[PDB]
Design a binder for this molecule. Structure first.
Ligand SMILES: [Zn+2]
Length: 258
């Protein structure tokens, strides 16, 4: 027994093992575009992924992560509302069983087909494990996916999914360029929050891009063929691995654009 997205162990049950689930800065949240405050003091985002070194792709039972070498400042995120350098460690997605759901954050209550999270940790803390224990330890870049035209830069990920169908399976995944997953504009919303999966630590500075990227129905369909279960166990399709919106509470969402 453990946490998951089922009916008996889903998000509504998490608070029993992880009390922080009912915390003051939980994520995701609904972004109300008319309540969001334009902050002219926000600097443009600085994404430097030219030297990125991807290593592996893993199905961890609740999603699939594409891991990167974070032993040096290769792929970093700076600027925006951040102070210091944040290193890319991995990226993963959240998706639904239908195109009408899948994203964790919503915009004016609108749900997207999926949501991409590029996770980075503040280098002043030494390692990822120490970073999560700090209020400014992580910076997560969130990108919405809508169904439409295919995204060429996403196909390499899609094609390797059959090799990591079940929990615990991993595959060599080198030379992948995450720049192919970025939208044209880097306009964003930002607010203080947390990880959206246990341990739900409140150590994240969220940076959600306004512009979604388009992926084809065939691409997102291949995500839905993954399994929550491990090999040799009853097959449970990996779908609807998203946490619903949490109360905003004493927080303000800021926008880098008007
Ligand atoms: Zn995530």
């Amino acid at each position: 027994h453990h946490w998951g997205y089922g009916k008996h162990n889903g998000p509504e049950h998490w608070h029993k093992d992880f009390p922080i689930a009912k915390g003051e800065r939980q994520s995701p949240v609904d972004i109300d575009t008319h309540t969001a405050k334009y902050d002219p003091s926000l600097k443009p985002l600085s994404v430097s992924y030219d030297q990125a070194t991807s290593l592996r792709i893993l199905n961890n039972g609740h999603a699939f992560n594409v891991e990167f070498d974070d032993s040096q400042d290769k792929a970093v995120l700076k600027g925006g509302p951040l102070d210091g350098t944040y290193r890319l460690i991995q990226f993963h997605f959240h998706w639904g069983s239908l195109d009408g759901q899948g994203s964790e954050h919503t915009v004016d209550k609108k749900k997207y087909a999926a949501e991409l999270h590029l996770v980075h940790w503040n280098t002043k803390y030494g390692d990822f494990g120490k970073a999560v224990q700090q209020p400014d330890g992580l910076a997560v870049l969130g990108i919405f996916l809508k169904v439409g035209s295919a995204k060429p830069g996403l196909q390499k990920v899609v094609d390797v999914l059959d090799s990591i169908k079940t929990k615990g399976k991993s595959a060599d995944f080198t030379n992948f360029d995450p720049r192919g997953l970025l939208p044209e504009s880097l306009d964003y919303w930002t607010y203080p929050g947390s990880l959206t999966t246990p341990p739900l630590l409140e150590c994240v500075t969220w940076i959600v891009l306004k512009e979604p990227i388009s992926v084809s129905s065939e691409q997102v369909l291949k995500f839905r063929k993954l399994n929550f279960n491990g090999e040799g166990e009853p097959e449970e399709l990996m779908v609807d691995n998203w946490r619903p919106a949490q109360p905003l509470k004493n927080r303000q969402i800021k926008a880098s654009f008007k």
